Design a binder for this molecule. Structure first.
Ligand SMILES: CCCCCCCCCCCCCCCCCC(=O)OC[C@H](COP(=O)([O-])OCC(O)COP(=O)([O-])OC[C@@H](COC(=O)CCCCCCCCCCCCCCCCC)OC(=O)CCCCCCCCCCCCCCCCC)OC(=O)CCCCCCCCCCCCCCCCC
Ligand SMILES: CCCCCCCCCCCCCCCCCC(=O)OC[C@H](COP(=O)([O-])OCC(O)COP(=O)([O-])OC[C@@H](COC(=O)CCCCCCCCCCCCCCCCC)OC(=O)CCCCCCCCCCCCCCCCC)OC(=O)CCCCCCCCCCCCCCCCC
Ligand SMILES: CCCCCCCCCCCCCCCCCC(=O)OC[C@H](COP(=O)([O-])OCC(O)COP(=O)([O-])OC[C@@H](COC(=O)CCCCCCCCCCCCCCCCC)OC(=O)CCCCCCCCCCCCCCCCC)OC(=O)CCCCCCCCCCCCCCCCC
Ligand SMILES: CCCCCCCCCCCCCCCCCC(=O)OC[C@H](COP(=O)([O-])OCC(O)COP(=O)([O-])OC[C@@H](COC(=O)CCCCCCCCCCCCCCCCC)OC(=O)CCCCCCCCCCCCCCCCC)OC(=O)CCCCCCCCCCCCCCCCC
Ligand SMILES: CCCCCCCCCCCCCCCCCC(=O)OC[C@H](COP(=O)([O-])OCC[N+](C)(C)C)OC(=O)CCCCCCCCCCCCCCCCC
Ligand SMILES: CCCCCCCCCCCCCCCCCC(=O)OC[C@H](COP(=O)([O-])OCC[N+](C)(C)C)OC(=O)CCCCCCCCCCCCCCCCC
Ligand SMILES: CCCCCCCCCCCCCCCCCC(=O)OC[C@H](COP(=O)(O)OCCN)OC(=O)CCCCCCCCCCCCCCCCC
Ligand SMILES: CCCCCCCCCCCCCCCCCC(=O)OC[C@H](COP(=O)(O)OCCN)OC(=O)CCCCCCCCCCCCCCCCC
Ligand SMILES: Nc1ncnc2c1ncn2[C@@H]1O[C@H](COP(=O)(O)O)[C@@H](O)[C@H]1O
Lengths: 66, 55, 120, 49, 98, 166, 347, 320, 110
């Protein structure tokens, strides 16, 4: 009748990470579409009671950011 | 036997599966840079000792 | 190969002896096919941006044709120059070396015994 | 009117068409003058008059 | 030829084989690269002084400056890798296998 | 033995490159590269390369290896000792060969004499020739200074671009 | 990235390539390569994702090892000839190390193990620059040292680059790795004819740059990075499928397309020098490249894959990407075979 | 293209028109939370430009004549058939949700384009940050599958990361029964078929997912039903916000230039809407694709670029 | 030779005093003690800014390495070229500092 065109079964063949997924090339995914892999913090200082520039007896739990 | 199997096998299909398998041997690398620089060192060793390209 | 020739006067597109050659005529079929490449460039430029292919950018297609003819003219001058310099080096080398080139004594086919191979 | 937002290519860009046609015709007259200068220089250097 | 040139070339090739065989760290790869640069610096200096070739005395300074800027570039690449993964281990750098 | 000071510093230089380049950890590798840079500097200084040896000690060690240890301080085995002693065995066997034969051949051929014999017997007057050649970077090395300064300005710009992360 | 800093950095890339092309001193050659690498590193890190940092790190390590081997070859040349003229070399060990260094800089096999990864990690524009502009300077140095190049070494690197560039792309769906293996195979084709006729080297280089620039420009214009995403292009702009059709048929070496021109001229020169087996094996290996090009053409142009519904929204919006010189680069990469004796302008 | 990198080099910096009133506002709420007139009132008090809720035909409103094209060319989806058959076999549900997400993505790109080119803040209605609130409700009520939610999360991961959050979120606490009474006073025979548990899942995903992550990356304002009516109280709450949270602080000229070069390329905004994850609710076969494309190409104003159409009377084509 | 004797003597005195400091009070047996910090046990977070000031030091140290032959280069017979290139190198160090300035690189360690 009319000119045949490929289907989803044909389309998902060309769409892996490789063309011939074998035993070695099996655990391979396509990358994220914008080539951005997910990123997979701030310091927490505890200035204890050991220090003269704190006036005597003080414990300071800081949260620095650099 | 001849003209759907064996003449169809001996020239094109054996070559096609051979190129398939050799392409799987080429492109099945684990991505590891250590292995690639190790292969580069093996190349310089073979080109110094085996084929004597320094001559 | 000819890199020792155009190094005494380097980076010359067309040297001073290139003007002694004839220039390509403006009806050169090489240059005409270059102008056809300009027309095809104008058509692809009107096609990739979804303009009307033949109807949009007649000034744009005219500048594509103008630009390709204007570049290809000097490219053909340099082409003719380099094949002329190739033949000049060849002829000067054959003239200045008679011992490297024997004039062949041309045996006529009455003296030449070729084997006959019968198709029977 | 047809379009809700005015297209960039609705009105012709007369500066762009002027630069296009002017640079094109300048290259055409420079090429014609170059070809006439080259045929005159050839017909002088090899002497074909 | 001269005996010390053998030693400097062998130090270059030992730093080569260190660079050409990763163990774990990328900083060690940069250190092997700069050991290669160090041997090149020494070998250039011994040649240029043994020749009494005066104008090339400025060449080892140029080698040192350009390859120290190269080393700073590599240290910044290492720092961005170790900001992404937490360490500069080379086995983290295999996402481009596929 | 005393006529062999460039050669003995070169043997220590090869041994130090085997020491760090077997890569225990980048801290001790930085240490071994620093000690190796010092003895290679001694190799340079014993040919009258006083400015280039001080360029080792100033520039190489006091700036760049300081930055390497600085980054090693922030960003962050049997194989090490085995490949270490393998390189030490290869080097001492090559030394024993070139000392028994006064000849060796691995890539090139090398004479086994004291390396003082490859020198010149002249003088240079009231100047170090190597110092005046480095001073000629300004009178003669105009293009060299232009491309070096432009590569360093681009180096600053490039570091600030790739470390910004935006 | 600042556009002013983008201008200065790309001009610094071009200035490094120019310093390699115009200088008569080996130190200035090495300086030009240092400037080139040092400037092109931020162009790879334009989007600031971990794959680009990984790719820039692998690129740095390979190019830095190549630059140190290049300087060692220069230093051996200063040992054995006392001079610095950029010309032939005066020692086959310096010749071998400089051939190794330039083969590393071109990503020729078996130093090919960075080009698909580095081309994969970086964007399409920086991949275009890496596969076209960064192939200029080491081919210039190989052009200037060719009286000293060992024939066995350059032909071994050439056959290994042609075979791996063939067999590498046969199992690939990413576009950038396909272009990278095509680069490795084409560098093999360039360096094989180099000691026979380097004009054909220049010819193959320029035609490869035109074809590669065409395909990367189409990939940028259609925002395609995989084969499967390239297969949606007919439902959005079918002229793009026709142009990637004819250009991928050109890049494999089909006549009458002008990518048949370089490899035909390479066989035309290598068979003059009585090498008949070697361009035959080269031409038989190029059919692998043409095979996965046929795969890409069937996936994109000559068929029509099923699409998704949101393409109907993209039917309404025109391309605003300034496709710079794309019709010129498509016309030149396909239809230049009648103008084949233009190759004498590279003499 | 009037704007590009050359317009950035020649002096035009987009913070030279970025005043305090230039705030992107997204007004949010349930299907009858009354936010419709509230967004227009907040827009007309502060002089901000109002962009309504993207229906099916927003992309028809931006291109061509502005009039709505047929649904077979834009969408291939019916909201009414979703209201009638929410568990439909033909896959209208996620196809409608994906088309609405692409429409809101286009509207959000237009919103940031207006904010960056004109320096005027824009009041929105259910931006892309509040589009999965209907997805998870349709999933909890079983209207679509797990793979549709996976496809949506893929498209959200590769679209919403390219954009900054809004400044002010004006959400309106309305109970479900008041929304149901407003639907029954509306009288729409399609809108009344919306069940109770669907609206309750909408409110659940609202109060438990949208506001707990927009409370930090931007500024929330959470009103009731009867105090979101006085517009002046809301505008007074907007004018006295300490703008200290959010990534709108670290946006100099270069980052907003990157954003402006992003949001004018609408095929780059809509680049990864059509990722080839062949999901049967949205996968169109090639014959129907070519048929709908060649019926769409015959529509007036659509065969060529928007200044190149003789059938709608674009003159001077022979000089363009 | 005299330099090597002086280096060996200074290194010997350093190692001798370190030997006396690590073995003469280590003749003590004193007592088997156990001894069981602002950060407790967590990993030291990287500081981008300290690395950037180290790289800025390295690049300006290379520019210093270019500037060091100036007291020798003042003796030259090409003095106009020497003054031009000397002012240009110090100018390039200043332009590197200006680009470090204006692009916010000298901030929070200014
Ligand atoms: C060449 C030698 C090829 C060696 C590899 C063979 C195939 C791979 C393999 O080993 O697979 C096992 C193994 C796994 O495969 P498998 O599990 O068996 O899967 C196969 C299936 O079971 C399928 O079942 P199967 O194993 O029973 O059948 C396999 C089939 C066996 O075929 C049959 O059973 C039917 C056909 C009979 C045999 C083929 C005859 C063809 C004759 C030519 C056509 C007629 C010409 C007439 C001419 C008349 C005048 C003389 O053989 C092939 O398909 C291989 C064909 C030849 C391969 C190379 C073709 C290159 C052509 C390039 C252009 C020229 O593969 C590997 O591990 C890969 C590495 C293999 C080892 C390395 C290669 C050794 C190379 C030695 C030196 C050669 C140098 C090159 C010289 C020639 C080229 C320049
Ligand atoms: C005379 C000395 C010099 C001769 C020339 C050089 C020597 C090498 C031969 C020519 C080159 C062929 C390739 C050799 C390397 C092997 C490929 C490889 O990496 O395989 C691992 C791997 C395959 O293993 P797999 O993927 O893990 O899976 C394997 C299965 O687990 C398990 O699979 P399986 O159980 O089937 O066994 C796997 C293995 C098994 O293969 C074998 O057992 C075959 C071994 C060779 C048999 C033929 C010997 C012929 C000797 C001369 C003739 C005798 C008479 C002499 C008299 C005069 C002549 C009549 O097969 C393969 O690996 C397939 C690819 C290798 C094809 C070998 C073709 C041999 C041609 C011989 C010409 C001579 O493939 C890759 O990784 C491919 C990517 C590598 C990219 C870089 C490749 C560079 C290669 C350069 C080689 C030439 C050196 C150049 C030096 C100078 C450079 C400037
Ligand atoms: C000439 C060759 C280049 C032509 C490029 C432009 C073609 C084009 O746009 O055609 C559309 C246009 C008709 O369409 P339209 O009315 O504008 O409406 C737009 C369509 O509806 C557009 O339809 P749509 O976008 O709505 O969707 C339908 C879809 C339908 O498409 C599909 O569904 C997929 C495609 C179908 C399957 C794949 C078939 C691929 C066939 C392409 C060619 C391959 C073989 C080429 C040779 C072998 C190498 C591979 O796409 C098209 O129809 C695309 C239209 C373009 C088709 C032709 C493309 C040609 C360029 C590539 C080949 C030429 C360059 C390489 C040549 C190699 C060496 C010879 O055709 C023309 O205007 C043709 C030119 C007619 C005038 C010729 C005058 C010649 C005068 C010569 C003397 C004067 C010059 C003197 C020079 C010297 C002065 C000094
Ligand atoms: C000799 C080597 C020459 C190498 C190529 C140099 C130019 C290309 C590189 C720069 C570039 O991207 O320019 C854009 C490029 C057009 O590429 P495009 O952006 O893709 O154009 C798309 C549309 O056409 C955009 O059109 P539009 O509507 O936006 O504006 C109309 C525009 C208006 O144009 C102007 O306004 C230009 C006048 C003002 C320029 C600025 C003055 C300051 O005119 C055109 O675009 C018409 C086509 C112009 C010619 C394009 C091809 C040029 C030849 C390339 C090499 C071909 C070699 C063939 C060899 C054959 C034999 C092997 O060129 C121009 O716009 C100016 C052409 C100047 C030609 C000079 C010829 C003599 C050279 C000596
Ligand atoms: C560089 C110039 C200045 C050099 C340093 C100053 C000069 C004097 C150096 C020697 C000082 C004495 C030894 C170190 C200090 C020991 C103090 C101490 O309590 O020692 C007890 C220790 C151990 O005594 P102990 O066994 O009673 O220790 C206590 C153990 N329990 C708890 C089980 C009871 O004595 C020694 O270790 C003996 C050291 C040598 C004594 C002197 C011999 C001649 C040295 C010359
Ligand atoms: C910007 C650069 C500004 C300074 C340019 C050089 C100034 C100078 O003294 O030049 C003369 C110098 C040296 O000439 P000279 O005047 O010292 O000549 C005396 C001759 N000698 C030194 C051999 C005793 O340079 C040149 O003549 C050519 C080299 C510079 C060419 C241009 C470089 C920049 C190119 C940018 C692209
Ligand atoms: C006389 C010449 C005889 C040989 C001519 C070439 C082989 C015949 C034509 C190419 C193969 C076409 C084909 O169908 O290959 C199938 C196979 C895998 O492709 P697949 O996706 O399965 O096919 C579509 C679905 N059936 O594809 C393969 O296995 C890959 C084939 C690669 C080899 C192509 C030719 C290489 C020639 C040079 C070898 C050196
Ligand atoms: C003998 C040896 C001597 C030398 C011989 C000649 C060698 C020529 C080598 C040319 C190398 C060109 C390198 C590629 C272009 C460099 C600039 C660039 O990257 O352009 C792409 C640019 C990216 O823009 P950006 O905004 O950064 O995009 C990011 C994502 N949108 O913009 C875009 O993406 C816009 C889209 C179109 C880009 C087209 C760029 C084409 C460049 C190549 C032109 C053709 C080559 C010259 C012709 C042959 C000459 C022999
Ligand atoms: N999944 C969905 N289910 C029902 N309505 C939706 C959905 N997504 C978007 N809407 C729209 O949200 C509108 C409600 O907003 P409004 O009536 O303006 O308060 C409806 O009229 C629909 O057009």
């Amino acid at each position: 009748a009319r000119q045949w065109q490929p289907d989803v079964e044909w389309a998902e063949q060309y769409g892996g990470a490789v063309m011939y997924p074998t035993k070695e090339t099996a655990h391979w995914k396509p990358p994220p579409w914008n080539d951005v892999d997910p990123p997979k913090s701030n310091l927490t200082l505890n200035f204890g009671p050991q220090h003269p520039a704190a006036h005597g007896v003080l414990r300071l739990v800081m949260e620095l950011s650099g | 036997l001849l003209d759907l199997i064996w003449l169809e096998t001996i020239l094109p299909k054996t070559i096609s599966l051979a190129q398939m398998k050799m392409s799987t041997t080429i492109t099945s690398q684990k991505g590891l840079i250590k292995l690639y620089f190790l292969s580069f060192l093996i190349t310089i060793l073979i080109s110094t000792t085996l084929l004597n390209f320094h001559e | 190969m000819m890199t020792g020739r155009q190094a005494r006067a380097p980076l010359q597109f067309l040297p001073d002896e290139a003007r002694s050659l004839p220039p390509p005529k403006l009806t050169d079929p090489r240059l005409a096919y270059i102008g056809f490449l300009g027309y095809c460039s104008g058509l692809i430029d009107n096609a990739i941006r979804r303009r009307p292919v033949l109807s949009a950018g007649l000034h744009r297609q005219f500048l594509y044709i103008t630009s390709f003819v204007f570049v290809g003219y000097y490219l053909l001058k340099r082409q003719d120059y380099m094949y002329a310099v190739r033949d000049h080096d060849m002829f000067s080398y054959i003239k200045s070396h008679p011992e490297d080139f024997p004039e062949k004594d041309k045996k006529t086919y009455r003296e030449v015994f070729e084997e006959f191979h019968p198709v029977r | 009117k047809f379009y809700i937002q005015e297209p960039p290519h609705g009105s012709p860009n007369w500066l762009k068409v002027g630069l296009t046609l002017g640079t094109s015709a300048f290259l055409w007259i420079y090429l014609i003058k170059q070809h006439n200068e080259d045929v005159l220089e050839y017909k002088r250097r090899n002497g074909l008059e | 030829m001269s005996l010390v040139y053998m030693n400097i070339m062998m130090a270059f090739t030992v730093s080569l084989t260190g660079l050409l065989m990763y163990r774990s760290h990328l900083m060690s790869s940069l250190l092997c690269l700069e050991g290669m640069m160090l041997s090149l610096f020494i070998l250039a200096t011994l040649m240029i002084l043994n020749s009494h070739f005066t104008l090339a005395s400025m060449m080892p300074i140029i080698l040192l400056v350009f390859a120290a800027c190269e080393a700073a570039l590599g240290l910044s690449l290492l720092v961005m890798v170790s900001n992404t993964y937490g360490t500069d281990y080379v086995q983290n750098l295999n996402l481009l296998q596929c | 033995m005393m006529t062999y000071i460039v050669f003995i510093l070169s043997i220590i230089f090869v041994m130090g490159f085997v020491g760090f380049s077997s890569k225990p950890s980048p801290i001790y590798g930085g240490l071994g590269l620093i000690v190796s840079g010092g003895v290679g500097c001694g190799i340079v200084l014993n040919f009258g390369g006083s400015f280039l040896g001080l360029m080792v000690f100033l520039i190489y060690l006091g700036g760049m290896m300081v930055v390497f240890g600085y980054t090693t301080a922030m960003a962050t085995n049997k194989v090490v000792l085995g490949t270490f002693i393998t390189g030490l065995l290869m080097e001492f066997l090559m030394v024993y060969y070139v000392l028994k034969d006064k000849e060796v051949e691995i890539v090139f051929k090398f004479n086994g004499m004291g390396d003082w014999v490859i020198y010149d017997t002249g003088d240079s007057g009231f100047f170090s020739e190597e110092a005046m050649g480095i001073a000629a970077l300004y009178s003669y090395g105009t293009w060299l200074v232009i491309v070096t300064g432009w590569s360093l300005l681009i180096g600053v710009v490039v570091i600030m671009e790739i470390t910004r992360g935006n | 990235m600042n556009p002013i800093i983008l201008i200065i950095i790309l001009m610094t890339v071009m200035l490094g390539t120019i310093i390699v092309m115009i200088s008569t001193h080996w130190l200035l050659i090495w300086i030009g390569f240092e400037m080139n690498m040092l400037a092109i590193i931020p162009i790879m890190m334009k989007k600031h994702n971990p794959r680009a940092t990984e790719a820039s790190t692998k690129y740095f390590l390979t190019q830095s090892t190549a630059s140190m081997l290049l300087m060692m070859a220069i230093i051996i040349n200063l040992m054995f000839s006392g001079q610095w003229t950029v010309m032939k070399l005066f020692n086959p060990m310096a010749s071998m190390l400089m051939t190794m260094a330039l083969a590393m800089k071109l990503g020729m096999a078996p130093f090919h193990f960075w080009v698909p990864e580095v081309t994969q990690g970086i964007p399409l524009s920086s991949g275009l620059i890496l596969l076209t502009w960064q192939k200029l300077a080491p081919m210039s140095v190989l052009y200037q040292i060719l009286p000293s190049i060992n024939l066995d070494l350059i032909l071994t690197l050439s056959i290994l680059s042609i075979t791996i560039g063939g067999w590498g792309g046969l199992n690939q769906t990413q576009l950038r790795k396909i272009m990278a293996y095509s680069s490795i195979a084409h560098m093999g084709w360039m360096t094989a004819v180099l000691l026979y006729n380097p004009t054909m080297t220049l010819l193959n280089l320029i035609i490869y740059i035109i074809m590669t620039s065409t395909m990367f420009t189409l990939f940028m214009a259609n925002s395609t990075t995989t084969t499967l995403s390239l297969s949606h292009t007919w439902n959005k702009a079918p002229i793009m499928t026709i142009l990637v059709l004819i250009t991928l048929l050109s890049m494999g070496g089909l006549p009458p397309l002008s990518g048949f021109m370089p490899k035909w001229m390479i066989i035309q020169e290598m068979t003059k020098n009585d090498s008949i087996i070697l361009p035959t094996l080269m031409a038989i290996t190029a059919l692998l490249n043409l095979y996965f090009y046929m795969r890409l053409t069937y996936s994109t142009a000559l068929t029509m894959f099923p699409s998704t519904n949101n393409m109907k929204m993209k039917w309404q919006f025109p391309t605003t990407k300034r496709m710079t010189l794309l019709p010129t680069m498509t016309v030149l990469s396909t239809m230049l075979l009648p103008l084949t004796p233009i190759l004498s302008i590279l003499e | 293209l009037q704007y590009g990198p050359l317009a950035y080099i020649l002096g035009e910096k987009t913070t030279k028109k970025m005043t305090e009133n230039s705030k992107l506002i997204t007004v949010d709420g349930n299907i009858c939370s009354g936010k419709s007139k509230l967004a227009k009132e907040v827009a007309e008090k502060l002089g901000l430009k109002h962009f309504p809720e993207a229906g099916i035909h927003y992309a028809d409103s931006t291109t061509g004549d502005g009039k709505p094209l047929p649904v077979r060319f834009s969408g291939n989806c019916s909201l009414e058939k979703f209201y009638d058959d929410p568990k439909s076999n033909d896959g209208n549900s996620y196809r409608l949700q994906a088309w609405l997400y692409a429409s809101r993505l286009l509207q959000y790109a237009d919103a940031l384009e207006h904010l960056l080119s004109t320096g005027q803040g824009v009041v929105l209605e259910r931006s892309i940050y509040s589009d999965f609130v209907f997805l998870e409700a349709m999933y909890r009520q079983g209207f679509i599958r797990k793979q549709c939610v996976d496809h949506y999360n893929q498209v959200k991961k590769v679209t919403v990361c390219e954009y900054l959050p809004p400044h002010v979120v004006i959400y309106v606490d309305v109970p479900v029964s008041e929304v149901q009474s407003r639907i029954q006073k509306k009288g729409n025979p399609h809108e009344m078929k919306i069940t109770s548990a669907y609206l309750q899942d909408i409110e659940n995903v609202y109060k438990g997912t949208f506001l707990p992550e927009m409370s930090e990356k931007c500024e929330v304002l959470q009103y009731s039903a009867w105090e979101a009516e006085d517009a002046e109280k809301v505008v007074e709450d907007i004018q006295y916000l300490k703008y200290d949270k959010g990534p709108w602080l670290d946006q100099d000229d270069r980052k907003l230039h990157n954003l402006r070069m992003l949001v004018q390329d609408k095929l780059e905004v809509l680049n990864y809407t059509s990722i080839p994850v062949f999901l049967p609710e949205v996968t169109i076969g090639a014959h129907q694709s070519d048929r709908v494309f060649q019926e769409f190409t015959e529509l007036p104003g659509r065969k060529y670029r928007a200044g190149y159409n003789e059938d709608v009377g674009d003159k001077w084509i022979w000089l363009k | 030779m005299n330099l090597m004797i002086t280096l060996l003597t200074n290194f010997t005195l350093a190692t001798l005093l370190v030997t006396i400091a690590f073995w003469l009070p280590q003749l003590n047996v004193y007592s088997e003690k156990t001894s069981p910090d602002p950060m407790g046990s967590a990993r030291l977070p990287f500081s981008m800014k300290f690395f950037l000031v180290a790289i800025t030091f390295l690049l300006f140290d290379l520019e210093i390495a270019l500037l060091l032959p100036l007291p020798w280069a003042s003796q030259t017979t090409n003095l106009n070229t020497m003054l031009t290139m000397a002012l240009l190198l110090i100018f390039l160090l200043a332009v590197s500092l200006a680009y470090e300035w204006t692009q916010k690189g000298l901030e929070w360690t200014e």
